[PDB]
Design an enzyme around this catalytic site. Structure first.
Site, PDB file in Angstrom:
ATOM      1  N   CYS A 191       2.112   3.884  -7.505  1.00  0.00           N
ATOM      2  CA  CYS A 191       2.622   5.236  -7.471  1.00  0.00           C
ATOM      3  C   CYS A 191       4.153   5.182  -7.352  1.00  0.00           C
ATOM      4  O   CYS A 191       4.773   4.081  -7.303  1.00  0.00           O
ATOM      5  CB  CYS A 191       2.060   5.946  -6.240  1.00  0.00           C
ATOM      6  SG  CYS A 191       2.598   5.080  -4.742  1.00  0.00           S
ATOM      7  N   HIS A 203       0.777  -1.845   1.677  1.00  0.00           N
ATOM      8  CA  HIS A 203      -0.361  -2.707   2.103  1.00  0.00           C
ATOM      9  C   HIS A 203      -0.916  -3.477   0.924  1.00  0.00           C
ATOM     10  O   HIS A 203      -2.020  -3.167   0.386  1.00  0.00           O
ATOM     11  CB  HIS A 203      -1.450  -1.785   2.681  1.00  0.00           C
ATOM     12  CG  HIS A 203      -1.044  -1.169   3.985  1.00  0.00           C
ATOM     13  ND1 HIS A 203      -1.392   0.090   4.350  1.00  0.00           N
ATOM     14  CD2 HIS A 203      -0.346  -1.707   5.066  1.00  0.00           C
ATOM     15  CE1 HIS A 203      -0.899   0.367   5.544  1.00  0.00           C
ATOM     16  NE2 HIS A 203      -0.310  -0.723   6.023  1.00  0.00           N
ATOM     17  N   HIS A 229       5.127   3.700   4.597  1.00  0.00           N
ATOM     18  CA  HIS A 229       4.260   4.517   5.509  1.00  0.00           C
ATOM     19  C   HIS A 229       4.963   5.415   6.468  1.00  0.00           C
ATOM     20  O   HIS A 229       4.347   6.354   6.948  1.00  0.00           O
ATOM     21  CB  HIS A 229       3.260   3.635   6.253  1.00  0.00           C
ATOM     22  CG  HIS A 229       2.752   2.532   5.367  1.00  0.00           C
ATOM     23  ND1 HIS A 229       3.356   1.306   5.331  1.00  0.00           N
ATOM     24  CD2 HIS A 229       1.739   2.516   4.363  1.00  0.00           C
ATOM     25  CE1 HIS A 229       2.744   0.551   4.383  1.00  0.00           C
ATOM     26  NE2 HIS A 229       1.773   1.304   3.786  1.00  0.00           N
ATOM     27  N   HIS A 249      -3.672   3.860  11.830  1.00  0.00           N
ATOM     28  CA  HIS A 249      -2.984   3.641  10.542  1.00  0.00           C
ATOM     29  C   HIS A 249      -1.491   3.889  10.729  1.00  0.00           C
ATOM     30  O   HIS A 249      -1.143   4.808  11.462  1.00  0.00           O
ATOM     31  CB  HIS A 249      -3.555   4.594   9.526  1.00  0.00           C
ATOM     32  CG  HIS A 249      -3.050   4.351   8.109  1.00  0.00           C
ATOM     33  ND1 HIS A 249      -1.806   4.775   7.679  1.00  0.00           N
ATOM     34  CD2 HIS A 249      -3.644   3.694   7.006  1.00  0.00           C
ATOM     35  CE1 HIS A 249      -1.612   4.399   6.387  1.00  0.00           C
ATOM     36  NE2 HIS A 249      -2.721   3.742   5.958  1.00  0.00           N
ATOM     37  N   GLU A 266       0.804   5.241   8.979  1.00  0.00           N
ATOM     38  CA  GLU A 266       1.336   6.567   8.591  1.00  0.00           C
ATOM     39  C   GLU A 266       0.990   7.563   9.721  1.00  0.00           C
ATOM     40  O   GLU A 266       1.762   8.456  10.048  1.00  0.00           O
ATOM     41  CB  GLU A 266       0.751   7.059   7.257  1.00  0.00           C
ATOM     42  CG  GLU A 266       1.379   8.378   6.813  1.00  0.00           C
ATOM     43  CD  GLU A 266       0.743   8.956   5.559  1.00  0.00           C
ATOM     44  OE1 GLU A 266       0.637  10.209   5.566  1.00  0.00           O
ATOM     45  OE2 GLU A 266       0.392   8.173   4.578  1.00  0.00           O
ATOM     46  N   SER A 301      -5.449  -1.437   2.863  1.00  0.00           N
ATOM     47  CA  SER A 301      -4.862  -0.286   2.126  1.00  0.00           C
ATOM     48  C   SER A 301      -5.873   0.909   2.153  1.00  0.00           C
ATOM     49  O   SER A 301      -7.018   0.800   1.621  1.00  0.00           O
ATOM     50  CB  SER A 301      -4.602  -0.713   0.680  1.00  0.00           C
ATOM     51  OG  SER A 301      -4.423   0.480  -0.135  1.00  0.00           O
ATOM     52  N   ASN A 322      -5.740   3.935   0.756  1.00  0.00           N
ATOM     53  CA  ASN A 322      -6.084   4.603  -0.521  1.00  0.00           C
ATOM     54  C   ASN A 322      -7.003   3.668  -1.366  1.00  0.00           C
ATOM     55  O   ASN A 322      -7.884   4.168  -2.126  1.00  0.00           O
ATOM     56  CB  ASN A 322      -4.819   5.034  -1.278  1.00  0.00           C
ATOM     57  CG  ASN A 322      -4.139   3.823  -2.053  1.00  0.00           C
ATOM     58  OD1 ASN A 322      -4.430   3.554  -3.215  1.00  0.00           O
ATOM     59  ND2 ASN A 322      -3.186   3.170  -1.414  1.00  0.00           N
ATOM     60  N   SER A 350      -0.815   0.627  -4.161  1.00  0.00           N
ATOM     61  CA  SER A 350       0.030  -0.466  -3.665  1.00  0.00           C
ATOM     62  C   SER A 350      -0.194  -1.792  -4.445  1.00  0.00           C
ATOM     63  O   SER A 350       0.435  -2.809  -4.102  1.00  0.00           O
ATOM     64  CB  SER A 350      -0.184  -0.670  -2.142  1.00  0.00           C
ATOM     65  OG  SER A 350      -1.595  -0.635  -1.877  1.00  0.00           O
TER      66      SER A 350
HETATM   67  O1  LIG Z   1      -3.105   3.624   1.349  1.00  0.00           O
HETATM   68  P1  LIG Z   1      -2.255   3.290   2.521  1.00  0.00           P
HETATM   69  O2  LIG Z   1      -1.731   4.536   3.250  1.00  0.00           O
HETATM   70  O3  LIG Z   1      -2.911   2.338   3.545  1.00  0.00           O
HETATM   71  O4  LIG Z   1      -0.890   2.587   2.076  1.00  0.00           O
HETATM   72  P2  LIG Z   1      -0.702   1.590   0.842  1.00  0.00           P
HETATM   73  O5  LIG Z   1       0.560   0.770   1.215  1.00  0.00           O
HETATM   74  O6  LIG Z   1      -1.852   0.796   0.436  1.00  0.00           O
HETATM   75  O7  LIG Z   1      -0.407   2.425  -0.501  1.00  0.00           O
HETATM   76  C1  LIG Z   1       0.863   3.133  -0.689  1.00  0.00           C
HETATM   77  C2  LIG Z   1       1.061   4.184   0.428  1.00  0.00           C
HETATM   78  C3  LIG Z   1       2.424   4.021   1.154  1.00  0.00           C
HETATM   79  C4  LIG Z   1       2.725   5.303   1.921  1.00  0.00           C
HETATM   80  O8  LIG Z   1       1.771   6.264   1.554  1.00  0.00           O
HETATM   81  S1  SF4 Z   2       0.378   6.794  -2.029  1.00  0.00           S
HETATM   82 FE1  SF4 Z   2       2.004   6.966  -0.307  1.00  0.00          FE
HETATM   83  S2  SF4 Z   2       3.751   5.884  -1.363  1.00  0.00           S
HETATM   84 FE2  SF4 Z   2       2.393   6.545  -3.001  1.00  0.00          FE
HETATM   85  S3  SF4 Z   2       3.117   8.644  -3.604  1.00  0.00           S
HETATM   86 FE3  SF4 Z   2       1.343   8.775  -2.104  1.00  0.00          FE
HETATM   87  S4  SF4 Z   2       2.397   9.191  -0.111  1.00  0.00           S
HETATM   88 FE4  SF4 Z   2       3.886   8.193  -1.519  1.00  0.00          FE
END
Ligand SMILES: O=P(O)(O)OP(=O)(O)OCCCCO
Ligand code: SF4
Length: 309
Positions: free
Chosen positions: A12, A41, A74, A124, A126, A225, A227, A269
């Site tokens: 993203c 993550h 985060h 978490h 965040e 992670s 998401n 991520s």
């Molecule tokens: O999905 P989470 O929040 O654990 O974080 P991620 O590092 O895997 O993915 C990008 C989100 C970073 C902030 O939302």
């Molecule tokens: S997944 Fe986290 S880093 Fe990616 S756009 Fe969403 S809030 Fe932002």
């Protein structure tokens, strides 16, 4: 065996910005660059950056005086920020703009002394960062994860109450918590729907369409992670076997034996090179050319701060 690719998948805008912030820091200032928490993550991204001289710490007391410290995408609490701020540290903030948007709401609620409820997963980073924007002892800041949590929450003044969410939740599970909050607290104020970001919403919509076609779904992403775990969970609840994998080495041949259609997606991520290697391994296991599904277009980019161009 047919291989389908979910669309959208993978990085993203916030993740691309946060990684660029660390790389550019390293390029401008040299090693070491300290980073509070994994910048995102993903084990491959973090190991990559570590081998280039980024040092990942949990606590600020692990960082030497006068160092450069980056906060992960985060986000961080006011306490972490003050702890860094009243210290010798040069700080760059990689917090995603969409997480900062939620922080600004919690901060406003804190100033008005009005109670806030966050929907999010305990522990978490965040959630720590967002709860950590609330400081007014006259109000309150409460975390709920499920309708059951809402059913047991008591607050001081439910006439003056707002809610906010973590950005990387299940859209469907969050909708059920918000339904509970509105029934319990009919005066509660919030966003139209939730604070789930475009990238989380879009990848869950894409994995739903993938799972409708595929017998088995591989989601590239690390165990911590949120998401990425929500994408696997979504395909599992649709009755497909789904596995969360860091890379191609993790694929067990049994998972795809006799499978006529395998789907691959990646969390926000996870870098594309990991998906490329996963596709190459599925091809060794009998898969053909990877077919990308049609998907909702994403067009958002978030630039690095001018200081780090
Ligand atoms: O999905 P989470 O929040 O654990 O974080 P991620 O590092 O895997 O993915 C990008 C989100 C970073 C902030 O939302
Ligand atoms: S997944 Fe986290 S880093 Fe990616 S756009 Fe969403 S809030 Fe932002």
């Amino acid at each position: 065996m047919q291989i389908l690719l979910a669309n959208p998948r993978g990085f993203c805008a916030g993740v691309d910005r946060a990684i660029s912030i660390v790389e550019n820091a390293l390029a401008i200032y040299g090693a070491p660059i300290y980073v509070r928490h994994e910048v995102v993550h993903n084990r491959y991204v973090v190991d990559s950056l570590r081998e280039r001289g980024a040092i990942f710490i949990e606590q600020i007391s692990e960082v030497p005086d006068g160092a450069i410290l980056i906060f992960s995408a985060h986000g961080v609490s006011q306490a972490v920020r003050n702890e860094a701020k009243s210290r010798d540290l040069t700080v760059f903030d990689a917090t995603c703009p969409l997480v900062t948007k939620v922080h600004m709401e919690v901060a406003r609620a804190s100033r008005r002394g009005e109670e806030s409820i966050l929907i999010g997963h305990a522990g978490h980073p965040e959630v720590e960062g967002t709860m950590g924007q609330y400081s007014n002892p006259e109000g309150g800041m409460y975390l709920v994860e499920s309708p059951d949590d809402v059913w047991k929450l008591t607050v001081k003044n439910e006439e003056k109450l707002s809610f906010m969410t973590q950005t990387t939740l299940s859209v469907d599970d969050t909708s059920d918590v918000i339904d509970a909050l509105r029934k319990r607290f009919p005066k509660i104020v919030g966003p139209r729907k939730d604070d789930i970001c475009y990238a989380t919403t879009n990848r869950q919509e894409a994995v739903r369409a993938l799972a409708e076609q595929a017998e088995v779904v591989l989601v590239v992403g690390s165990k911590n992670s949120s998401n990425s775990n929500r994408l696997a969970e979504l395909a599992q609840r649709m009755g497909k076997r789904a596995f969360l994998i860091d890379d191609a080495k993790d694929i067990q041949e049994e998972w795809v034996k006799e499978v006529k259609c395998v789907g691959v997606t990646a969390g926000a991520s996870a870098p594309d090179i990991l998906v490329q290697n996963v596709v190459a391994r599925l091809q060794q296991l009998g898969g053909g050319e990877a077919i990308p599904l049609e998907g909702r277009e994403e067009n958002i980019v978030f630039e690095v701060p001018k200081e780090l161009r």
